[PDB]
Amino acid sequence: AIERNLARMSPLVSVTPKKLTWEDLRPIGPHIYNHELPEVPYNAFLLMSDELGLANMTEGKSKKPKTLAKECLEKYSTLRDQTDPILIMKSEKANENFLWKLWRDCVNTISNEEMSNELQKTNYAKWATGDGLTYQKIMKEVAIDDETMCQEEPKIPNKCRVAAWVQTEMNLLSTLTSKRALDLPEIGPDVAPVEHVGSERRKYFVNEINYCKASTVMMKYVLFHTSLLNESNASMGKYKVIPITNRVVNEKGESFDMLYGLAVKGQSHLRGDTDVVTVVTFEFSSTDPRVDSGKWPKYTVFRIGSLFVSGREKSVYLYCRVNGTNKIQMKWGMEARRCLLQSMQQMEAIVEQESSIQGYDMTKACFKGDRVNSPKTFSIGTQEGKLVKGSFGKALRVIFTKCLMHYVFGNAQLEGFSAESRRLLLLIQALKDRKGPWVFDLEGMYSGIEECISNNPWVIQSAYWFNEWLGFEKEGSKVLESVDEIM
Amino acid sequence: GMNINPYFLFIDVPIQAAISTTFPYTGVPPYSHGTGTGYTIDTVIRTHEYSNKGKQYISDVTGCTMVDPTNGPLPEDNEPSAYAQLDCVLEALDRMDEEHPGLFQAASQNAMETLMVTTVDKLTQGRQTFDWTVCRNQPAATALNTTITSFRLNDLNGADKGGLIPFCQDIIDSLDRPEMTFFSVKNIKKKLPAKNRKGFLIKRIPMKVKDKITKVEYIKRALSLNTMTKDAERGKLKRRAIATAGIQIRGFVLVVENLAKNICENLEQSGLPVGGNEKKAKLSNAVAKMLSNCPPGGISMTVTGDNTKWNECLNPRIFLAMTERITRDSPIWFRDFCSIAPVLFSNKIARLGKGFMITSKTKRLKAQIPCPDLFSIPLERYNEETRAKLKKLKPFFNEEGTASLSPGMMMGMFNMLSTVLGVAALGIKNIGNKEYLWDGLQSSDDFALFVNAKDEETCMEGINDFYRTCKLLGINMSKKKSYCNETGMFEFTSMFYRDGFVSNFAMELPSFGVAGVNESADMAIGMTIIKNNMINNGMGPATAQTAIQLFIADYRYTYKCHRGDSKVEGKRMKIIKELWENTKGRDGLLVADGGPNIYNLRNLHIPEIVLKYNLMDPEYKGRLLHPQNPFVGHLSIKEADITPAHGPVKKMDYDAVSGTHSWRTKRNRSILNTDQRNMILEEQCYAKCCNLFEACFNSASYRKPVGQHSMLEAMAHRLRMDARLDYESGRMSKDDFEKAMAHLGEI
Amino acid sequence: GMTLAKIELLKQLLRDNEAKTVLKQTTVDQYNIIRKFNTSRIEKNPSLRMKWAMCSNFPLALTKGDMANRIPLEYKGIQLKTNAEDIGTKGQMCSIAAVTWWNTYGPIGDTEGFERVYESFFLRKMRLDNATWGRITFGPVERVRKRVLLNPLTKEMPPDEASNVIMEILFPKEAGIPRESTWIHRELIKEKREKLKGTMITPIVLAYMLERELVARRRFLPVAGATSAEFIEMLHCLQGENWRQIYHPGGNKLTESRSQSMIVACRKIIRRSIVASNPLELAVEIANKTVIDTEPLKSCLAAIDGGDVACDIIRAALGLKIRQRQRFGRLELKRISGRGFKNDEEILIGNGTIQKIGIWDGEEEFHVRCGECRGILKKSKMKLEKLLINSAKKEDMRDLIILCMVFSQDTRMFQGVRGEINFLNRAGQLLSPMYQLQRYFLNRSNDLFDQWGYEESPKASELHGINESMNASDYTLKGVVVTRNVTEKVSITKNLSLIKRTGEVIMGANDVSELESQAQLMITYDTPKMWEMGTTKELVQNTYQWVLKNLVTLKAQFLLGKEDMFQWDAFEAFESIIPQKMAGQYSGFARAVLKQMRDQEVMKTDQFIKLLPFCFSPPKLRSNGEPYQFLKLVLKGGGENFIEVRKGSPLFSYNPQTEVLTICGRMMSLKGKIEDEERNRSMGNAVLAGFLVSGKYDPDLGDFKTIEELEKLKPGEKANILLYQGKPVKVVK
RNA sequence: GAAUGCUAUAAUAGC
RNA sequence: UAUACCUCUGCUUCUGCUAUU
RNA sequence: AGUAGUAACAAGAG
Ligand SMILES: [Mg+2]
């Protein structure tokens, strides 16, 4: 029967197979290079590389979040006092007056001598938190009679082009700082040599991350998303001023409370996990938004004074954005610490692999180098068209950053891209392994990847980085073309 | 400057070796919003889009628009085809039976002998099930109860016998009933005397009224499937629809799967039911043999494979054929018993969910249009996409707001049996005695075909053949997602093989969080997840030690239980700080009591309460482990009227001691606003009956009690003996015994 | 007098006509359905719901009782509990702060027997506490995925048997039909009942705590030389893919586990000693420094009375009384006369399938024993001859017969296999056919007895036969008789054979089992180069690592002296994982290819490295002088344990683009240790012995020649060779 | 010189 | 009408199957 | 507004 049916079936039905060649692997998502599309705009919840925390050295033992936010401004009074709105940038559908009034309401409320961080539901605060903007439910009986009532055309994510600021984030979040943020608690005493190896191995891994920008950002993101969830449930029917706080320790070993700005949390009667709560963010920054204007169309910026960044008097701006979050995102925010594990593991795999080859603990060897082995170096990035080698510690941090960006820009666009591109990564690894891969419908494979590339900054930059690397590998392959070819 | 590219790791490390970095599982999984009717309708359209060239007719039972692709015209193109040829499905199974002699009857025997032992309560372990009495999803255990109570009213007491078979007999009999009656509670006001001005208080009471439905209306509800959207669907841009089935059809599906499982377990290429290390072992062994068996000079090629529209294309009538062909030697009753489940699925009806919401932006009004009233408004009032969907739905639509769906399996109903039909394709191995030989692995739609041939041009002739073979079983290979390479590396069910299945730590990262059971449990689970990851998912000791720290943070923030010596302000922290000062043995305090974390790699597998017990204060442990503490809820040891809605105490894998931190959360009281209130009384009734039964028979908590006699009869006799032996022994007095026998006399 | 109150409450409950009808209609079976009846939908996102709910004022529900009312409503301006009653508990709701309050100023309850209740867990800790930690070692570990026991049991029983025991301990009245099991564990029942007697913990907890230490938690895990539960519980700290930790637990270790491990050690020693000159030299060297857990192998072999050929060989090698005592699970034999020759054959079984079993030749006599019962057995190739036995226990007699019948491998025994018998595991692993047949017939014995056949009982002095029911009968089983009635100084050859004082041998290294298995306890070799007793992949990786380490010298020494650096102690170990029947042939090939690279200038450092280890085993050439030719070199173990000659393989492959050599997934840089010319220098020259490249594929010569077609050429003849896909080469002799 | 087959409220995988 | 600047609610606004058990 | 993204929330109920 099978023979009979296969015999009489149309030859048009086939896998239509073709052997994969490097030249067939065209660049993914060519639209990201089209300059006619808009630059993908910064759409994160909080600021990252553009952030500016006001340093406030503590006794060491904690206090209430209002009390620290007050005492932090009390030190930087020149900013806290600045009551004249020097507007620089305005978000299309924002209200300068309302936003500034709100900022001042926050600063005043947090600066005052009262216990509460509650905000009166002013005409501005209402507009800012989106008071009563929900539509009214009516009977289907009445709905059916109304001709003007229609099913709305689904809003789609618009197409954007590549944006330097994404590259610039990675670069700066990757780099080292003097400041340790992580709040890693105590562990039981070591006994088993495995534990002594683990503990000593941590001192290299944990520190390398703890002393990098990405870490502080992550910790801020967590510690905010905590207090935001704590308020959202506790103070449901209250507008509340939540300060964007974070504890940091310098090389000298001194605790500094870091105020990055103030947020206001609208009413939070969150039934569904997806149900939204409007959070309006006021964030300190040294970044002049006029420099890269296509980055900040979502933001409203006020120049609010200056500070000595070192010997330089840098001007201080205030980035104001009406933002939103839900139960899920807030929860996953409190579980952003696990970015450590995903990055740490992947490299501990390399250390443990290399350790089996050499026959001793290659931890200290891989980072710094020992008497026998010179330090482990990785192809890290590019510099005017040419590949650059970097540290084990760098290659670690570059992953930790990536894993943070996986959270920060984590949506269905990324999920779909990550999963579909992984399929093409493996087809490349085949060509690299010289395992002569074949494909059936490559275009179909591509379309699945390319339909995911819309308005996600990380997805658009990943398509750039992928297309960049592919070109480098495609060059590397040439070496193998003429091997065992006689000639 | 210097521009970092993270993809430049893949220059130093091969993709497979660092695959973990391609899984963004620190990120948020995609959740659905509002209605799933759009996604549901899509399935209903697509299922028929792949069967449209088949035999279309009207069901003289339901009145529904039935479509049948089986034995239909073979495809002209590579668009998904449901037109499977019975002969080819049978031939494939005959080869499978020849390769595995006696397996079919061997399975059928065990599957049949199981069914004879299987009780009804078996159906009370299946999450949310469609209840036909209320036409809403309900807990499996309740959905059954509502069916048993309703069956009794139609003179169907087969349930009471206790075996599944006689209950199943009642289900296929209930289809013959001219009308089906069922209870549906109505509220009733009643004056009650109270210490009140007016001197009374009105309170609404539930009253079980008997509703009836016609033979057809009931049949459609029996054949009905409720539909949702799949939430937290990882690594996918756009959402997909999922279906929950009726307590009627759930019964018959258990046996047809249980059958296919027995077959799969004893197949070389089955990925189901084996899992984790058992699966890795089996696949690692399978790859090794099929690798070394490659002819010298020839080429071994592995097709990393996925099948498209697996559910939409796989037809029930083909699954019917499979049960018939598999049960060939089984007795006539069991051949029929199996036949039912596929028969129900070949006449099944898809419920279209919530509906569509229509709005006016100017007026700021929104309204949900229910599925029955979908064609109540002109289609111009629906958006472009939905208009087409509804137009294509039109000829499969039922006025009660449902869709006829004869073709298609529906989402994941016959996984085991589909795996078999898959394997059956891999069982062919060659067509026309050509210079190739294929053999693979199959876990539902997911398959990895190995082809040993003379040259890769020949391998492709084999793949091209396999492709065409699958098309005759209604199995469509995804040309977009499937890819092929020389044997050595492949992907199967997100397991990445590169001369051995590689570690992929990222996949199970989400499990590292605070599980959300309670304090005492979440610690155990927390450490057990690390311990188990150190073994299976290749987590090194440093990362493992960090994974403790990170947990212990999340725990302390989640359960607001920071170190007693910390200065973190909080409501619980105020008493935690007093406990820290009051306590001498502070290392004996649990983390949840602001105690210090003493966990490390070596002791992950010991309960915290057992680790610290030795260095606790006697008063502290005396509290922490109080035998009759109010947080856990024990027995009376006194007998007033202690009767709460206490669910059956389960047997969870995590090892943790029962103490004050083993508490339970308050029940979501959203129910108090809606008219569903009534059910709380129905619960708090059953609760009373059970809780007391457990006071008579203490073994009921531990082991399932057996008996087709009355609960009252059981309780009566036990208490009657208890009283007699309590009197004759001297535990009870004459005055008490007289009362005992007098009260029991009244029953 | 709890009885009265229950009857009083029943009368209260029966006044509710809705409750009455539930009790009247709902059957005892249906209790299990209405118990699970609830409003609550199953919480799909509990991690979140918890994180959220902990920010609410009263997230927990107390049980309505006098104790709940010992918690105050507020404490120092903290609302501890509300008046509002939970839907579920029908008791007051409270804040997490309530727990913290109770744990601080709550009433101090009696925790009597707690440690006796949770003994299981306290032992778990006691083991970790009274343990000793050795050294961590960095190097390849071949982890194998095997179904192991996760937790030490007090006594192992099937869940059914286990459940019935717990019932007798906790709920005597509601036990049901008294089973045999009841008597079998009467000691355990009484012991536990006496130990849990004066406790206040809830019976349901006590029930699961016993279930935890009676019912077996047996699951697949990646293990390496450690299977004993008390090791498996610590498996996370024992090893990873690339490191190993020596760990000695506490409490006690079984003589049975001590035994089965002690075998693996000896087998592993012998399997490696065989390859060296003077095996007895090495066998003694290793065995004196072999430690099983914390106990030296010599002390272990002295202490234990049992163990296979290997144990006796090593016993002799160390100078200890060799015990010719065998075991077949429950059966225990001691050889009087005979010599067994285990040959693999295709056996047909009763159900009608073909199983591969090792069948023993020769007439042999043993002292068979099973519990109190004792006997003498005589058997030949797949036929039981005669079986004398004593009349001890009715079941111990019944078992010995079934065991002896199976042990004999009688063709009648294989005929009586009617039903489902699994030789292959769910994960396609092998289960010992003889040990599965033993396990099958111990349950279903009536089939074997009927399928065997009966005859007349003996009419001798003390000899009287027994039938199926095990009673003094007229008809007895064909060659079964019951009676009333119940060493020599050896020396061992350097080549490992046990010779008698006469000259006849009793054992040899050729008589030990070829099956490597996971040791129960941790085996340690206290000699440097312990890796030599490793697995195929471990030995393979450790060898090539040692080659790469000493490549500088080893490659130079080769260009001077020819055969000087072929004999190396690493390449000896490496030989013991090569099939002995191809070892010689492979060396013949490899050396020819290596010398061909040296003499004709056409070097290839990756190939040198790959082949050099194979050049140890004394060469074995063809009869016409020329060496044997190969495409791949198969090694001991799984079908993926092979080295390709032309391509790469799961053990060994070289990436020239990166100059990266991959050895069992571990990557090593050949940067620096590589000549300039090699890149362009073809592989075709170092692929066949006495064969060198001339040009590219010449269509006139036709298709690519096989190993055979290549071997069957005459010097100066051209041929088409394929190295790997898309690299055709034209090679000449 | 082998086994002992199961059966969670988490997470993963596929549908 | 109203009580109502009151009261109740925060997964119950339909969350499936099969495996890892 | 905003979140967000093929459909919702921007409180719901007596
Ligand atoms: Mg698929």
TrEMBL record, chain A:
Coiled coil: none annotated. The chain holds residues 238 to 724 of 726 of the full protein. Keywords: Cap snatching, Endonuclease, Eukaryotic host gene expression shutoff by virus, Eukaryotic host transcription shutoff by virus, Host cytoplasm, Host gene expression shutoff by virus, Host nucleus, Host-virus interaction, Hydrolase, Inhibition of host RNA polymerase II by virus, Manganese, Metal-binding, Nuclease, Phosphoprotein. This is Polymerase acidic protein. It is an enzyme of class 3 (hydrolase). It is found in: Host cytoplasm; Host nucleus. Influenza RNA polymerase is composed of three subunits: PB1, PB2 and PA. Interacts (via C-terminus) with PB1 (via N-terminus). Belongs to the influenza viruses PA family. GO terms for cellular component: host cell cytoplasm; host cell nucleus. It comes from Influenza B virus (B/Memphis/13/2003).
From TrEMBL, chain B:
Pfam families: Flu_PB1 (PF00602). Mg(2+) 3 binds at D306, N307, D445. One of its GO terms (molecular function) is nucleotide binding. It comes from the Viruses. One of its GO terms (cellular component) is host cell cytoplasm. It catalyses: RNA(n) + a ribonucleoside 5'-triphosphate = RNA(n+1) + diphosphate. The keyword Transferase applies. HAMAP family: INFV_RDRP. This is RNA-directed RNA polymerase catalytic subunit. It comes from Influenza B virus (B/Memphis/13/2003).
Automatic annotation (TrEMBL), chain C:
GO terms for cellular component: host cell mitochondrion; host cell nucleus; virion component. InterPro entries: Flu_PB2_2nd, Flu_PB2_6th, Flu_PB2_C, Flu_PB2_CAP-bd, Flu_PB2_middle, Flu_PB2_N, INV_PB2, PB2_helical. Residues 525-678 form the Influenza RNA polymerase PB2 sixth domain. GO terms for biological process: 7-methylguanosine mRNA capping; cap snatching; DNA-templated transcription; symbiont-mediated suppression of host gene expression; symbiont-mediated suppression of host mRNA transcription via inhibition of RNA polymerase II activity; viral RNA genome replication. Keywords: Cap snatching, Eukaryotic host gene expression shutoff by virus, Eukaryotic host transcription shutoff by virus, Host gene expression shutoff by virus, Host nucleus, Host-virus interaction, Inhibition of host RNA polymerase II by virus, mRNA capping, mRNA processing, Viral transcription, Virion. Its main location: host cell. Residues 679-733 form the Influenza RNA polymerase PB2 C-terminal domain. Residues 253-322 form the Polymerase basic protein 2 helical domain. Plays an essential role in transcription initiation and cap-stealing mechanism, in which cellular capped pre-mRNAs are used to generate primers for viral transcription. Recognizes and binds a wide range of cap structures of target pre-RNAs which are subsequently cleaved after 10-13 nucleotides by the viral protein PA. Plays a role in the initiation of the viral genome replication and modulates the activity of the ribonucleoprotein (RNP) complex. This is Polymerase basic protein 2. It comes from Influenza B virus (B/Memphis/13/2003).
